[PDB]
Amino acid sequence: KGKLPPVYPVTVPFLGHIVQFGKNPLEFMQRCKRDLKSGVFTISIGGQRVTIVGDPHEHSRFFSPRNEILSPREVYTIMTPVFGEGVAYAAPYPRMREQLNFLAEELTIAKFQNFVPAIQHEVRKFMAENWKEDEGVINLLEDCGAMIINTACQCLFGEDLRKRLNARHFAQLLSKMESSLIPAAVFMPWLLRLPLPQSARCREARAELQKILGEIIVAREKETSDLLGGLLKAVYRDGTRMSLHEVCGMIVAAMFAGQHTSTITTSWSMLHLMHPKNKKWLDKLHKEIDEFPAQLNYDNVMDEMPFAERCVRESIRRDPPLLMVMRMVKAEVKVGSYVVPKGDIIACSPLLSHHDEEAFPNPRLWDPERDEKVDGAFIGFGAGVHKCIGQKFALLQVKTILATAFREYDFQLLRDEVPDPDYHTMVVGPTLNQCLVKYTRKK
Amino acid sequence: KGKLPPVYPVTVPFLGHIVQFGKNPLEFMQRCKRDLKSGVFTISIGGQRVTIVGDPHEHSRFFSPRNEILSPREVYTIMTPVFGEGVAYAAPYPRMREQLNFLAEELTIAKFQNFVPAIQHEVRKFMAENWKEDEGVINLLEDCGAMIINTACQCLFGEDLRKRLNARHFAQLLSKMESSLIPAAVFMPWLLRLPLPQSARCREARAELQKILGEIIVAREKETSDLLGGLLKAVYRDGTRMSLHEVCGMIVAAMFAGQHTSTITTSWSMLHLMHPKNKKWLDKLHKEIDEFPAQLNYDNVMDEMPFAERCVRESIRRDPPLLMVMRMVKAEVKVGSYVVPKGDIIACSPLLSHHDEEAFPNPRLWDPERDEKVDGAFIGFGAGVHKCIGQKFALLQVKTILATAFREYDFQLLRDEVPDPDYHTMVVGPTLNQCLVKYTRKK
Amino acid sequence: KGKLPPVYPVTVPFLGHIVQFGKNPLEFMQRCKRDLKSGVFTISIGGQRVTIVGDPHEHSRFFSPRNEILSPREVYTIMTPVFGEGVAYAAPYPRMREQLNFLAEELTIAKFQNFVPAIQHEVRKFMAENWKEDEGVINLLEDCGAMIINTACQCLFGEDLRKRLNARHFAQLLSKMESSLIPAAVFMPWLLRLPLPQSARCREARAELQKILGEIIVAREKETSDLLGGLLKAVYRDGTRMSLHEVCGMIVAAMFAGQHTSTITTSWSMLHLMHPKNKKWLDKLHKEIDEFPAQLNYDNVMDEMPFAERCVRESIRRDPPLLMVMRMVKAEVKVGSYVVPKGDIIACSPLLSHHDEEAFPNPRLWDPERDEKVDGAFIGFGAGVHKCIGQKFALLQVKTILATAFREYDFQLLRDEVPDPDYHTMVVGPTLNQCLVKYTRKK
Ligand SMILES: O=C(N[C@H](Cc1c[nH]c2ccccc12)C(=O)Nc1ccncc1)c1ccc(N2CCN(c3ccc(F)c(F)c3)CC2)cc1F
Ligand SMILES: O=C(N[C@H](Cc1c[nH]c2ccccc12)C(=O)Nc1ccncc1)c1ccc(N2CCN(c3ccc(F)c(F)c3)CC2)cc1F
Ligand SMILES: O=C(N[C@H](Cc1c[nH]c2ccccc12)C(=O)Nc1ccncc1)c1ccc(N2CCN(c3ccc(F)c(F)c3)CC2)cc1F
Ligand code: HEM
Ligand code: HEM
Ligand code: HEM
């Protein structure tokens, strides 16, 4: 029964704050911060109070609590049709933890034996089919997209599986599923209690994939180290296995999670590096990768490439593909001198934290050699219990593609300045039609 | 199980693409076309995938299929309260076909015996009451509106009927009904499953009209070639008549369909013709109509006026009053090298087809003497099974009003360039407040 | 069965007219007026016809009818969770009248014995804690906010009550409640039939306040002229008392009603008065208040300050904090030469009436010495049966704060022109971040 955060007073147009959030979210949240003179503050959306933790020193309040107190279940009901009932966020809180952890186990550094070669293998194959000429023009964003999905499938899926479901069909399933979503319904929980037609189409689409996975398992058992096999070998505390229904859901979530995020990180990283005023940084990277043979390996990429890590990390720092991390308060919580009541939605913003000037002096500058001036202010992958569990995989895959690509080609951007981000989409990246790039096959 | 069309990635603001569609729909769909490099493509609206057939060579894919495969029922649930249950699109697919065809029968060239005189009669009466002076100022769009409703009622309704329900009351019923609609709910099928208050008001409004029609029928049977009479004489395959409930619905649909479309076509046609840089075309039309007596007839208007037809047709070509034709895919369908999955909404756009530069070189120019450079690219009235069944009537009425009006008055537009279209409305026409025109009674 | 008002034709974007109403509502409604050439007219919002009475000569049509004919119940279902079921607008029409009247009784001039001293007392205390220096910078809008809530609580609540619930907790309850609202759902009655989570949080919040009130009553009865006591002494026609549930609801409605309105009136009044080109008016006010002692009283403020009244009234005239008064037509009603059908929403607009140039010549000028050129055109507090019942209290409190403040400090605005209104909010006032003001403690 203490002090509530200050409240931006309710506005009339229905969900109108989302339109501002989709146009310039940074200025928007910065105004909120200035006007009410508080890093912690509250806006109302569709009659849903949303409290934004906008002070980087307070990050621990947000990321520390357990799922029974700050819960993501209620904020991600949109996903239940694409992932499936009883799966991840639509799963009881214990079963949910074990599930997320099983997937995390499958993506530990300890599991990446063949990955870097499988990945180099795919990138080379891709560059050979589409970058055939001595020079040519491409959309970098679309091509990274292709590479990420193709590389992920080589790593994670066995030969038998890929033969039944290639990456291009997989990419279509993921796209169809995305397109069926209503992101703004995060603020319309009443909508999601109603029958949606496209909820049912997507469950049929996911039952087709489940069928495939089942046929494969039966085949394997006639004649189990890929993701599918790993997950089927998993055991809960009570000594039971995951259903194939749960496994199919986890695999979809895994690929869905990485489709846009990894893609966008690669694109930005490349875009900054090929930019003239960053020549200096491009040379620094050439030195680092020239120092290696051609066929790379785990150690090279993960252990022996600290400057690549910086470039990638700084790209996420400048343009976090996920603008906002959110939770449903199931029991009230302190934050600075305030309390945040149960039922509120509580939110923390990588975009905002990453442009705080105490935290990142001259935030608009991309500088791979900078460091946070506030500890924990970088939250591109979050922090705490809920920190990204595909971070190490995401980074392997991005670092490898960088290293393979820049070794074999020069890249020229076909406009003066680096692309504007497009804040209209769920996952934020560079504007598609500003991503035109001319490759040049190297001597 | 083939290739899906490329998908514009989902955006956050709720139904935000509609706001762009209501501001500059042409640029919007053109961007979609450029960015994804495909004439066929997909956007998501309110979680509803909408596939746009944007390549004029593919028109046959869209317009060929039968109602059991590409259905308009689900896209036009908005209309069920104004037309009535069991009527047109709210009717089982067989009964629906017969109904639409009965109405089509009543509007065949074979049925237009007295129409041109009845129409001249009304236009003269109108010009005498409101264009009394030697010169004066008017809103062309409002006055065409009046003329279209008055002329339609003379043609279609008998004396007894019109005495009980004049055109000005009829125009009010149509307006009240329109105003009760939620066009954007095409993308909110969940909304239309909920009780709407204004659904019930409109059914009471339509029961008042039904009562009137019934009283008239009883009167006629004491003392049947108008639309009301024709339709009551109709027989289904199974040998039964339409209910009066179905007939009342058909009559409303008929008048509703033409209220704005015909009006807008007339207005544009006049606006282009009275424009100075089109003098040449105005003279061409004067020659064509001077060549006739004063009391016109069917042959004169429909058979002996090919240049009027061109001017009208080109006006629809430049500014199709219906931007978009849509269907619900009930079973998947090929389109070019793509397949379009069941549950998608499939759409084809006269606005887009009519501004394709292969199809209509310099699309922005109004030129009555042009021709399509792609066969079937003109779709102002659609094509195939679902082609407009009031096309011949619409055109009779527009051609006649042109011929009667320009014979008796000169017209001057009170601003430099022709009016901008206003894309905000369901039916698109010229901006109301740019439609100021000065008439001058001729010598 | 007469003439309907003309209808602005339906637009596509969902509730898109609200976005225009939240950007420039005056231009919006003025366009509607010009374009259709009628003071009375109709727009459609979310499929809900809304008829605007925009001609000041017709005000009596709107404000005369009884609650059984023009009802506010259906337009204010948004408030039912914050005020409570069975209370005010969620109450049967007889019980509703008696309730509103009981509250009106408690705010008659006859009840304001200690009020002016209690109020001076609070304003002095406030100026001493926050305006401590010889000079300093403040947000006038936030500080009036504080003063209004603190002064209201001194007047209306006894010592025992205030000790259990101070104004700062009270202000938080009011804010939390506001933030839970969906103003645009005035046009989505279907939404309010669905379970909203934040409906339930707010009822728990109001049950906590009810508990407090009950504990206090029990305490008082051990050891009844404040608002709480007055209302508990009230008797309905049938000889029963209000429940404590109804009393708690009335008290919340009372404080909610005044939080923003009174605040905004004070702010504007001060902002205009401290503006240089209004020096003349500032001096006129100084003369009026210098003519009094320091400890003021009822007569001084209400009877002996006619120029303060003018300044306040003109501020409401220029910027009515409530843009629009609305009602649900339960039975059709004449308005000028039109009829307005049952089910329509009928609306009248202080913003519009207050900027009609026949009514207020040069409406954009703030002039405390003007007069209406149309009788009844000023409707800042409405008119007729539903006229504001906190008007006399609102004005006491504003006049007093003006008189106490300007006596003790000079005020300087920190930008050239007076703040723009911000039309985005439910209650409209000056833009927060343009309200920076420098006080100077007087000699
Ligand atoms: O891309 C999104 N989600 C998808 C689907 C998803 C959700 N949760 C997951 C957990 C694990 C795996 C996948 C998911 C996703 O891939 N998220 C994701 C999460 C973690 N790592 C990688 C990717 C996504 C992207 C944006 C988004 N919002 C748009 C902005 N917004 C918002 C929030 C607060 C505000 F104050 C505001 F004005 C707008 C609502 C949240 C909501 C979303 F669900
Ligand atoms: O005027 C409209 N309909 C009305 C009512 C109606 C519907 N179907 C009928 C069949 C027969 C008779 C009447 C009707 C109408 O009069 N339509 C019409 C149809 C055929 N001939 C003449 C007039 C209308 C006008 C526009 C509209 N849309 C607005 C734009 N929109 C849209 C569509 C696709 C997109 F990708 C997008 F971004 C927006 C949704 C469709 C929807 C509509 F129903
Ligand atoms: O502040 C508002 N209400 C609140 C809550 C409330 C409602 N009724 C009451 C009766 C007694 C006490 C409180 C209330 C309020 O405090 N109103 C109020 C009423 C009377 N005296 C002082 C204050 C409020 C403020 C604005 C509003 N609208 C936004 C603009 N709008 C609108 C209306 C017509 C249009 F044509 C349009 F385009 C938009 C919908 C009405 C609706 C609202 F309820
Ligand atoms: C550049 C790529 C990626 C970025 C930027 C990113 C970002 C994030 C962020 C910000 C969070 C929220 C963490 C928190 O709440 O503390 C997160 C969580 C998560 N990410 Fe990612 N992510 C990426 C890739 C992936 C990949 C490839 C996967 C593959 C499975 C994945 C799965 C997850 C999961 C499962 C969670 C949260 C689960 C939980 O609630 O514990 N992410 N990610
Ligand atoms: C200039 C006037 C008009 C224009 C521009 C217009 C345009 C169109 C268009 C584009 C279609 C879609 C056809 C398709 O899907 O292939 C259509 C269908 C239709 N129009 Fe019109 N129309 C006009 C006037 C009228 C009139 C006066 C009526 C009177 C009844 C009418 C009734 C219909 C009907 C019933 C359909 C489609 C029925 C079906 O699904 O088969 N229209 N019209
Ligand atoms: C400057 C301050 C205020 C302004 C500008 C304002 C304005 C208005 C307006 C425009 C109306 C509509 C009246 C009608 O429909 O004829 C009204 C009604 C009302 N106001 Fe206020 N008001 C103010 C302060 C207050 C206060 C302090 C209260 C405290 C209780 C209050 C309670 C009400 C109530 C209960 C109604 C209408 C009840 C009914 O339907 O009869 N208002 N006010």
What is d(CA C270, CA C143) in angstroms, rounded to the nearest whole number?
12
* CA B230 from centre of chain: 23
Q: How far is the CA of A52 from the centre of ligand 3 (A)?
A: 27
What is d(CA B356, CA B352) in angstroms, rounded to the nearest whole number?
6
Q: Looking at chain A, how many residues does it have?
A: 443
Identity at B423, one-letter amino acid code: Y
What is d(CA A285, CA A298) in angstroms, rounded to the nearest whole number?
18
Pairing of strands A421-422, A429-430: antiparallel
| Mutation choice for ligand 1 from A186, A259, A263, A346, CB with most ligand atoms inside 8 A | A186
Specify which residues C333 forms β-bridges with. C340
B238 Cβ neighbours under 8 A, 6+ residues apart: none
- Tokens representing residue A247 in the block: 């496994």
What is d(CA C79, CA C326) in angstroms, rounded to the nearest whole number?
14
- The DSSP 8-state label assigned to residue B291 in this structure reads T
* Residue of B335, B351, B247, B259 lying closest to B27 (CA atoms): B351
What is d(CA B221, CA A328) in angstroms, rounded to the nearest whole number?
70
Three-state DSSP class for B326?
strand
The minimum CA-CA distance between C398 and chain B, rounded to whole Å, is: 41
Q: Angle, to 10 degrees, between the axis of helix B244-273 and the axis of helix B391-408?
A: 40
* Residue of C14, A12, C51, C25 lying closest to B424 (CA atoms): C14
| Radius of gyration of chain C, Cα coordinates, nearest whole angstrom | 22
Pairing of strands A70-71, A325-329: antiparallel
DSSP string of A167-219, one letter each residue: HHHHHHHHHHHHHT--GGGGG-TTGGGS--HHHHHHHHHHHHHHHHHHHHHHH
- Among the partner-chain residues B198, B260, B424, the one whose CB lies closest to the CB of C47 is B198
Residues of C within the annotated binding site for heme? 388
Are the Cβ atoms of A191 and B190 closer than 8 angstroms?
A: yes
What is d(CA C44, CA B196) in angstroms, rounded to the nearest whole number?
14
- The DSSP 8-state label assigned to residue B333 in this structure reads E
Pairing of strands C48-53, C345-348: parallel
Dihedral of the CA atoms C223, C229, C232, C235 (nearest 10)?
A: 120
Number of H helices, E strands in chain B: 17, 12
The minimum CA-CA distance between A11 and chain C, rounded to whole Å, is: 4
Are the Cβ atoms of A193 and C197 closer than 8 angstroms?
A: no
State the count of interchain CB pairs (< 8 A) between A and B: 84
What is d(CA C281, CA C284) in angstroms, rounded to the nearest whole number?
5
Q: How far is the CA of A387 from the centre of ligand 4 (A)?
A: 6
What is d(CA C323, CA C379) in angstroms, rounded to the nearest whole number?
10
Identity at A77, one-letter amino acid code: T
Closest residue by CA, ligand 6 atom 35? C389
Q: How far is the CA of A392 from the centre of ligand 1 (A)?
A: 20
Q: For residues C282 and C274, is the Cβ–Cβ distance under 8 A?
A: yes
Experimental method for this entry? X-ray
The shares of helix, strand and coil residues in chain C, as percent rounded to the nearest 5, are 55, 10, 35
Dihedral of the CA atoms C143, C144, C146, C149 (nearest 10)?
A: 180
Q: How far is the CA of B407 from the centre of ligand 3 (A)?
A: 55
Say how many CA atoms lie within 13 Å of B359 toward its Cβ.
23
The minimum CA-CA distance between C222 and chain A, rounded to whole Å, is: 27
Q: Which residues of B touch A (CB under 8 A)?
A: 3-4, 7, 9-14, 16, 34-35, 42, 44, 46-49, 189-190, 193, 341-343
Interface test with chain A among C45, C182, C432, by most A beta carbons within 10 Å: C182
H or E segment to which residue A328 belongs? strand A325-329
In the numeric block, the tokens 């109509």 are attached to B289
- Among the partner-chain residues A179, A183, A432, the one whose CB lies closest to the CB of B12 is A183
Nearest atom in ligand 2 to the alpha carbon of residue B259 is 16
- Tokens representing residue A184 in the block: 């703004």
Identity at A425, one-letter amino acid code: T
Are the Cβ atoms of C46 and B182 closer than 8 angstroms?
A: yes
Task: Give ∠ CA B388-B389-B391 in degrees, rounded to 5.
Answer: 70
Whether ligand 3 lies within 6 angstroms of the CB of C317 is answered as no
| Mutation choice for ligand 2 from C10, C12, C14, CB with most ligand atoms inside 8 A | C12
- Among the partner-chain residues A13, A35, A343, the one whose CB lies closest to the CB of C198 is A343
What is d(CA C329, CA A175) in angstroms, rounded to the nearest whole number?
48
Contacts by residues A130-135 (CB-CB < 8 Å, ≥ 24 positions apart): A131/A409, A131/A439, A131/A441, A133/A441, A134/A440, A134/A441, A135/A438, A135/A439, A135/A440, A135/A441
Q: Tell me the ligand closest to C397's alpha carbon.
A: 6
Is the domain spanning C1-443 CATH 1.10.630.10? The answer is yes
H or E segment to which residue C334 belongs? strand C333-335
Q: Which segments of C8-134 are extended strands (E)? A: 40-45, 48-53, 70-71
* Residue of C267, C237, C292, C341 lying closest to C2 (CA atoms): C341
Are the Cβ atoms of B425 and C10 closer than 8 angstroms?
A: yes
In the numeric block, the tokens 């800042």 are attached to C380
| Mutation choice for ligand 2 from B191, B256, B352, CB with most ligand atoms inside 8 A | B256
Are the Cβ atoms of A49 and C179 closer than 8 angstroms?
A: yes
H or E segment to which residue A326 belongs? strand A325-329
Say how many CA atoms lie within 13 Å of C329 toward its Cβ.
25
The shares of helix, strand and coil residues in chain A, as percent rounded to the nearest 5, are 55, 10, 35
Indicate left, alpha or beta for A410 from its phi (over 0: left) and psi (-120 to 50: alpha): beta
Are the Cβ atoms of A425 and B9 closer than 8 angstroms?
A: yes
Domain ranges of chain C: 1-443
Closest residue by CA, ligand 1 atom 28? A426
* Residue of C25, C19, C17 lying closest to C428 (CA atoms): C25
Pairing of strands C48-53, C40-45: antiparallel
Identity at B112, one-letter amino acid code: F
* Residue of A24, A437, A25 lying closest to A269 (CA atoms): A437
Q: For residues A304 and A295, is the Cβ–Cβ distance under 8 A?
A: no
- Among the partner-chain residues A4, A47, A193, the one whose CB lies closest to the CB of C180 is A47
Nearest atom in ligand 3 to the alpha carbon of residue C82 is 5
Give the nearest chain A residue to C431 (CA atoms): A35
DSSP string of C148-189, one letter each residue: HHHHHHHHHS-HHHHHHS-HHHHHHHHHHHHHT--GGGGG-T
What is d(CA C45, CA B379) in angstroms, rounded to the nearest whole number?
31
What is d(CA C166, CA C151) in angstroms, rounded to the nearest whole number?
11
Nearest atom in ligand 3 to the alpha carbon of residue C259 is 16
Are the Cβ atoms of A9 and C195 closer than 8 angstroms?
A: no
Q: How far is CA C301 from CA B320, C120, C399, in A?
A: 66, 11, 7
Q: Tell me the ligand closest to A399's alpha carbon.
A: 4
* Residue of C390, C346, C400, C405 lying closest to C106 (CA atoms): C390
